[PDB]
């Protein structure tokens, strides 16, 4: 591990310094269906006409990115995504830009979102939930080692693959930071107290969100929920959490450590770091190596009927792709 990582940082650093650019054209892909929608761009199932392969293309309208002040966050996402490599992170195949939009072509992950499955099913069993949590633990350990903070962990950002494993997507708030950071971003339900409290934070926000995930997976609903964000923020800083009566004893305490308001007592930010998590009673059966190798028995395999099948994804209205005669935000996005 410390060994594995050391080598991993070396590769990430190479890519960090020399990020790839315009590795494709819009015209090489056949637009097929929208798999998801964004606040300034959507995601489409697309087909590379030369290779016959399908991918998921993320399109971002340059002007909307500017109106929403997400330029640097958009630059972070691409730079970071093209440099990373782990079994549980989506692969950025290509990226290019044109007069109107920015494009990120990634590997298509046929299984759908963890969200849809969780919602439909209700709640996952601790064993099923732990299978997932363990993969997020290894991803964070990998991510933080490269000085990155993910910042948007939620069922909506985790995709299931043919093999029943996890694929983390959406690095829109990912940042390589040595030291503290101050942007208020993420999803309300998963916001750590420090963030909502505007005090400046580090990786520990990623360990809080994990606690919120495991809980949402095992209970079927978030530990803090209301109808309007302010009410949510209220519960989060309150430092009070109630556990469903079916949570195991080991789960109740793993969670009490991750959902530690005091980030100087919070698992993942202590002296032992991630080991305090990997070595917790709840994970006693977990064979970390076996998981990293994908040799464990996945409890659930979503089934897709052939390539390009999009049944595990919701139907969206198809807004048409428009591209201006004129370049739109050339200077802002020159490094993209």
């Amino acid at each position: 591990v410390k060994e594995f990582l050391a080598k991993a940082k070396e590769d990430f650093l190479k890519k960090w310094e020399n990020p790839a650019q315009n590795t494709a054209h819009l015209d090489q892909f056949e637009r097929i269906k929208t798999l998801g929608t964004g606040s300034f761009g959507r995601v489409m199932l697309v087909k590379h006409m030369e290779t016959g392969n399908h991918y998921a293309m993320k399109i971002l309208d340059k002007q909307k990115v500017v109106k929403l002040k997400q330029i640097e966050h958009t630059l972070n996402e691409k730079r970071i995504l093209q440099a990373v490599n782990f079994p549980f992170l989506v692969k950025l195949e290509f990226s290019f830009k044109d007069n109107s939009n920015l494009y990120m072509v990634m590997e298509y992950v046929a299984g759908g979102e963890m969200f849809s499955h969780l919602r439909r099913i209700g709640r996952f069993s601790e064993p099923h939930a732990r299978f997932y949590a363990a993969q997020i633990v290894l991803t964070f350990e990998y991510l933080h080692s490269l000085d990155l903070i993910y910042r948007d962990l939620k069922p909506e950002n985790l995709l299931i693959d043919q093999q029943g494993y996890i694929q983390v997507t959406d690095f829109g708030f990912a940042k390589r930071v040595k030291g503290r950071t101050w942007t208020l971003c993420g999803t309300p339900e998963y916001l750590a107290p420090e963030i909502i409290l505007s005090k400046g934070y580090n990786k520990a926000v990623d360990w809080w969100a994990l606690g919120v995930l495991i809980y949402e997976m095992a209970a079927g609903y978030p530990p803090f929920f209301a109808d309007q964000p302010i009410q949510i923020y209220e519960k989060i800083v309150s430092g009070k959490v109630r556990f469903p009566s079916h949570f195991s004893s080991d789960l109740k305490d793993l969670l009490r450590n991750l959902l530690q308001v005091d980030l100087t007592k919070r698992f993942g930010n202590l002296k032992d770091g991630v080991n305090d998590i990997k070595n917790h009673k709840w994970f006693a059966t977990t064979d970390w190596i076996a998981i990293y190798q994908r040799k464990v028995e996945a409890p659930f395999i979503p089934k897709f009927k052939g390539p390009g099948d999009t049944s595990n994804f919701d139907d969206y209205e198809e807004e048409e792709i428009r591209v201006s005669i004129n370049e739109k935000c050339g200077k802002e996005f020159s490094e993209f």
Binding site: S39, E156, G186, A219, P229
Partner: peptide, 20 residues
């Protein structure tokens, strides 16, 4: 039940992230 409460709530669908 908390579950029932969550289901009748306004945030059961896909949650968007907060920018500004």
């Amino acid at each position: 039940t908390t579950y029932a409460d969550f289901i009748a709530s306004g945030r059961t669908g896909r949650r968007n992230a907060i920018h500004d």
